[PDB]
Structures are given as C-alpha cells and as structure tokens.
C-alpha cells in the first residue's frame, strides 16, 4: 500500500491592503492506495519407466522450459495483461494518453500512413518538465523509418 | 485474494430511489456516506439528515425523525438558515463517480437521509448507502 | 470524531429488492456482500452471482451477464452442479441481523446479483450491498 | 516577373548578387547601405521546393 498526493489546493489569493482579515482557500488530497501480487503455477508429469530408460535427460529440459515460459509470459503480461489475476498492463488499460496519425491521399483514395513528420513531432511533444524519456518500438518499425524516401528518390 | 470485507465495514441501504431507511449506528463507532447516481441530473439536489431515538414501546424500533444540528468546524463562512445539517449533490456529477461525506458529530442511535422539499424529482436518480468502521461489541 | 469513511471503502447498491445493479469493481482489489433482510422470510432463499465484461462499444458500460464460476477449496465437499457461485440466505434470519460473504476468485470487471428462480418472491424483502476496499484505480 | 501572367515588380536574390559584383573593382572597395527590412527581406527568400 502507498500514498499518492493527488493535487495541491490554492490559498494565497491577492486582496486589497486596508482590511484585517484573510480567506480560507481549499485544501488538497492524499488518496491512500493499495495493490496486490499474483501467483504463477502449474504442473507436469513424467513416467518412471519411460524417463529412466530414455535416450537422455528430459527432466532438466523441462526445468529450463518452465523458467523461460515464466520469463516470457511475465513480460508479455506486464505489457498487455488484463487486470483479472494478471498485472494490469500499460497497453490495454488505456490510461496512457494515446495519439493517432491522420491518413494521406493516394489516387483519390485515403489510406492510413505513418510519415517522418509524425515520429519527429511525436518524440518532441513531451512535457519538458517530466525529465528525459526513452522510447520503445519494434525492430521492423525502425526498419520503416530507415528506408524512407522523398519525392525525387533520395533517402 | 480478496478478504471477506463484509464481516467489517458492513453497509446498508439509506436511500433507494424513493424510500428512506433507518440504519443503526449504535454498535459501530464511525460511519460515512457514498453518494452515487444512476442517471444525469437536472438541477442541484439537496438532502436532509435526521436521527432517531429508541421508542419507549421497544428499545429496538425506530421512533420519530428529528433533524441534526450542523456543528461548524473552524473556517466556516456560511451556516444554513436553521443551523440544521444538509448535504447537496452539486450539479454536473456524472453517473459513474461516487461521492463521499459524513456528519462530524454523531448523536442518537441511527441515521436517516431524505430529499429536501422541492428537490424530490432528481432524488429518484440518486442512490445513497452507509458503511461502518467499528464494532465495540 | 468519526473519520470520513466514504472514501477508503465506499459502498454501492447491488440488490434493492426490485432490480439488480452492476457495481464496478475494477479499480478496487477486494469486495464483499453484506446481506440484510427487511422482514420475516418464508423459505430458504438463494442468490445467483454474475460477473460482467466491458462492452465492445463503450469500455465502461455493462455487457452481458456472464455467470461466475464456483471454485472449491481444501474442505469443500458439496459442490453444486458444475460449479456456479450461488449463496443461500438460510431461514431463521430475523431483521437487525446482517450476514456477509464474498467470492474467492474475482473475474471480469464487475458483479451483479439476482434472485434464483424459485426465491424471487421472498427476495423482495432483502437487500444486498457491496463495500470495495482500497485499491489503486 | 510574370506571376500567372500579371507582371508584378519583384526583387530576388539573383538581383542582389549581380548588382554588387558588377562594381568595377578599379574604383576601390565599396560598402553597401540599406534599410534593415531589406536585409530581412533577403534573408527570408525561398526557392520553389521550399528551402531557404
């Protein structure tokens, strides 16, 4: 459990001099919070006689098969996990403010596109009083930026 | 893992659209309100707090409905003309947003809420309940 | 000195005796029901539990009313048909006596309660509310 | 210059360079004087693609 200062109020409002009084502004909030932790479990079986007289070790393989499946599933859940018995991810809960890029024309049609304007506008539009901020994108998406061409043909 | 949060903090209905209800705060030692709407509002909407006494016929049955004098804190600028407590749901409260409030000095054995006169049309759209905090027995 | 307990475990109406009400439980991580009868009952009354899903059109309005899957624990020895969360208010439950319970495994976005077929007439004399608990929102 | 067949007067950077280098260097070194808006006018010119 943890606290989250929601907002400050406002108290010091300008007033005229010749009066011996003041004005009670409004106070803020504290908004105590909480949160849980979820579990990850499962089982499998072998066969005494099969595993014993087998070509090679099958057990240790399943061990590594669990640690990685746990590893990849956690990160995958941490991003897009639906609240129920899974950590609510930052993709799907739609709490982050999300932009969208308006389409372009082609031969009279109108197709959705992702120009070089967007990525330069998107990254440079982030409140400068929150500090620096890294970005994330899939390798192919960056491979889309690299191979961009202007009207003549130059990169 | 959710705890059985009904074996403490047990709530009861206080205003289900068109019917008030006495809710005993005798044993418990702390209690508030949770105002939640079901539709849009039209104008402002007030509510009148009350309290009751154990009737002489049976010490476990509601008596009459007496109001609650609003005790002021520090830094109060206005007091209702009669000095009786009153809570108002401000205009423009969307029906997916709960409001919270409580009277700062308990008196009696149980509480009651009712729409202030002339403001009983919107009153239907409101739903009020009361939670608790202690046991004492 | 009674703390405002509206915030920090508010409550909402789940079954007002006439119609059910879905109560959002997404922003909170714990919840429970506080039953309360208004009059003398006739026969054992049971209630069916339902959980909902965010509608594909609007992500914070009710969808359909899916049925919560009942889950046993260590010493559960009388699971009903196929498993469905269904609590039963026993008889010999006079008024001014609240009973409370909850469902162990949460699922969906919010819960709704409705009288089981065969107990709707008795259920017109009962009230059910929920008091969530704490969580981040 | 013929803006869509209208022939408005104009003054473009090609004029300035051709005007200042034409000074016969046998007279000496010469300084040019002008109003600061004109220099602002030169500094804001654009070629058809849009660059400065």
């Amino acid at each position: 459990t943890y606290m989250k200062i929601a907002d400050y109020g406002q108290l010091g409002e300008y007033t005229c001099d010749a009066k011996c009084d003041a004005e009670f502004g409004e106070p803020g909030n504290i908004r105590h919070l909480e949160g849980k932790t979820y579990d990850y479990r499962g089982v499998f079986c072998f066969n005494r006689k099969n595993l014993q007289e087998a070509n090679y070790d099958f057990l240790s393989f399943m061990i590594g098969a669990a640690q990685r499946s746990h590893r990849i599933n956690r990160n995958q859940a941490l991003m897009i996990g639906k609240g129920v018995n899974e950590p609510k991810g930052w993709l799907t809960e739609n709490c982050f403010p999300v932009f969208q890029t308006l389409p372009v024309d082609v031969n009279g049609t109108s197709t959705p596109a992702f120009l070089a304007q967007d990525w330069r506008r998107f990254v440079t539009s982030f409140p400068a009083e929150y500090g620096e901020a890294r970005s994330v994108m899939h390798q192919n998406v960056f491979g889309y930026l690299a191979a961009m061409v202007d009207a003549n043909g130059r990169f | 893992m959710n705890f059985n949060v009904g074996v403490d903090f047990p709530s009861f209905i206080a205003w289900d659209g068109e019917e008030s209800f006495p809710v005993k705060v005798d044993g418990f030692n702390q209690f508030g309100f949770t105002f939640k709407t079901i539709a849009a509002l039209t104008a402002a909407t007030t509510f009148n707090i009350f309290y009751h006494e154990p009737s002489d016929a049976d010490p476990c049955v509601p008596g009459p409905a007496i109001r609650v004098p609003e005790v002021p804190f520090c830094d109060t600028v206005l007091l209702s003309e009669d000095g009786l407590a009153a809570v108002t749901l401000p205009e423009t409260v969307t029906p997916d947003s709960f409001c919270a409030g409580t009277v700062p000095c308990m008196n009696g054995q149980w509480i009651s809420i009712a729409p202030a006169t002339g403001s009983e049309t919107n009153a239907a759209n409101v739903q009020i309940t009361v939670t608790m905090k202690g046991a004492t027995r | 000195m009674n703390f405002n307990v509206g915030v920090d475990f508010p409550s909402f109406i789940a079954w007002d005796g006439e119609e059910s009400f879905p109560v959002k439980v997404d922003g909170f991580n714990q919840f429970g029901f506080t039953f309360k009868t208004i009059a003398a009952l006739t026969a054992a009354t049971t209630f069916n539990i339902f959980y909902h899903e965010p509608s594909d059109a609007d992500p914070c309005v009710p969808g359909p009313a899916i049925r919560v899957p009942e889950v046993p624990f260590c010493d559960t020895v009388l699971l009903s048909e196929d498993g469905l969360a269904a609590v039963t208010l026993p008889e010999t439950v006079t008024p001014d006596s609240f009973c409370a319970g909850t469902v162990p495994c949460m699922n969906g976005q919010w819960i709704s309660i409705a009288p089981a077929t065969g107990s709707e007439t008795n259920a017109a004399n009962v009230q059910i509310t929920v008091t969530m608990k704490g969580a981040t929102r | 210059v013929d803006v869509n067949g209208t022939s408005t007067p104009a003054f473009l950077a090609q004029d300035w360079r051709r005007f200042v280098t034409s000074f016969p260097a046998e007279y000496g070194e010469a300084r040019s004087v002008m109003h600061q808006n004109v220099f602002g006018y030169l500094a804001a010119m654009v070629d058809a693609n849009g660059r400065f």
Binding site: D118, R121 | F35, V87, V103 | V7, C60 | -
Partner: peptide, 28 residues
C-alpha cells in the same frame, strides 16, 4: 458541515489527432 469528496470511476478513453504542418505551398 459535510465535506463532499468525489472521484470518477471509469476514465473515458482519449484519442488526440497528432496533426502536423502541411506541405509548403507558396502564397500566390
């Protein structure tokens, strides 16, 4: 004196059009 304290339950999804400068067109 009741101190009403109110929060919203569901946050409505947002979507902002990330408009950008149109292509350069001469004035004339």
């Amino acid at each position: 004196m009741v101190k009403l304290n109110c929060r919203p339950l569901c946050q409505a999804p947002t979507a902002s059009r990330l408009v950008s400068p149109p292509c350069f067109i001469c004035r004339g």
